[PDB]
């Protein structure tokens, strides 16, 4: 039933949800597929065997956190069954598959297969009344109010630049990359072994991400600060164990600008966006210098955009006024943009009816997705 549609703020590392019109999603949670690895000895033990939410956010010492959205791209549809299965909990929903329209999101430059299998799920297993799935960049622009703008959006194993002028069909100019913080955090586990911290669990990885968002910043000087003596910021566990950092906190995101540090040829966020600029036009380029939509929680760092400003200043020519737009909610900008877009009346054609997909197939929606 076409009631207030469920605006699902997806995400590689953080896939959460809420509704349309609202400005606060009631179901905020990341991407995590965990399950206990022990045997219930004493009866009365808390169970469910697939822990998500407070269970997973409570029983971290027992779960094998899995991830289908590898680089945002789903690789396990069964994990998706469990993901929505937990999502479909009424304590997680308070609804059914049909009680509200669904608004799911995407990332650019993805295969059809994803939309296909997902349509099967939510229109056959689940039975969603109306739904359309598309890039989060558009929703971010909705939240900015802008129409012409390069959406620099980053997941957690995803980092990408989306050049947009009033939401036009520019997939050749529009770029996308799938590499970020998951891998950076894994490289921080490499840092751990180099430091001597013997850790190899996904629960430990969560803590590394807590440091990533917490005890990890950026600088602007790579080699200079590399030569500069650090302080080795001692992090403290929930246990409180001393964990020095050093300059590794900003050394690991240098890889986001220097992709070969992990052994992956690319050109860095900046140059890739510059390539997206190259595909645009000189006049429109100046607008896009002024129209920079940085987004993604992964982009939250000390002088992140300021360092990147210096980078592009070394890249872009003279008399080029570069202007960045990056709210503090570089996550919910997509959620609120979907909250607005989902709250439209013209949106009828924008969504896809249930029976429509049930008639012929997802290729019709693939026509609708472009």
């Amino acid at each position: 039933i076409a009631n207030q549609p469920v605006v699902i703020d997806n995400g590689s590392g953080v896939i959460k949800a809420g509704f349309a019109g609202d400005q606060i999603p009631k179901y905020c949670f990341p991407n995590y597929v965990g399950r206990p690895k022990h045997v219930r000895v004493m009866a009365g033990a808390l169970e469910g065997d697939i822990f998500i939410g407070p269970k997973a956010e409570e029983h971290r010492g027992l779960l094998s956190i899995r991830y289908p959205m590898e680089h945002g791209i789903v690789k396990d549809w069964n994990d998706m069954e469990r993901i929505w299965q937990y999502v479909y909990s009424k304590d997680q929903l308070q609804t059914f598959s049909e009680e509200h329209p669904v608004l799911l999101t995407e990332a650019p430059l993805n295969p059809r297969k994803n939309r296909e299998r997902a349509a099967e799920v939510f229109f056959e297993t689940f039975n969603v009344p109306a739904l359309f799935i598309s890039m989060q960049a558009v929703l971010s622009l909705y939240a900015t109010g802008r129409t012409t703008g390069v959406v620099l959006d980053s997941g957690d194993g995803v980092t990408h630049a989306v050049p947009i002028y009033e939401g036009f069909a520019m997939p050749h100019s529009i770029m996308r990359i799938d590499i970020a913080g998951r891998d950076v955090s894994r490289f921080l586990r490499l840092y751990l072994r180099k430091e001597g911290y013997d850790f190899h669990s996904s629960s430990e990885f969560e803590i590394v991400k807590a440091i990533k968002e917490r005890a990890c910043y950026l600088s602007i000087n790579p080699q200079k600060d590399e030569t500069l003596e650090t302080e080795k910021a001692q992090y403290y566990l929930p246990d409180g164990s001393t964990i020095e950092i050093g300059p590794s906190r900003f050394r690991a995101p240098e890889l986001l600008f220097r992709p070969d540090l992990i052994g992956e040829e690319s050109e860095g966020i900046h140059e890739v966006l510059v390539f997206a600029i190259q595909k645009s036009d000189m006049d429109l380029r100046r607008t896009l210098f002024s129209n920079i939509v940085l987004s993604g929680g992964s982009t939250l760092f000390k002088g992140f955009g300021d360092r990147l400003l210096s980078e592009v200043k070394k890249l872009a020519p003279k008399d080029v006024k570069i202007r960045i737009s990056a709210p503090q909610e570089r996550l919910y900008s997509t959620w609120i943009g979907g909250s607005i877009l989902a709250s439209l009346d013209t949106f009828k054609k924008m969504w896809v009816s249930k029976k429509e997909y049930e008639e012929d197939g997802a290729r019709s929606i693939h026509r609708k997705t472009f």
Binding site: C28, G305, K313, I324, S325
Partner: peptide, 24 residues
Amino acid sequence: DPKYADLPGIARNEPDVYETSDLP
């Protein structure tokens, strides 16, 4: 700002707009 308080993963003390030192 109130919505910036409502959700946890939101940091502050950084201007949302970063521009170049456009030398007049």
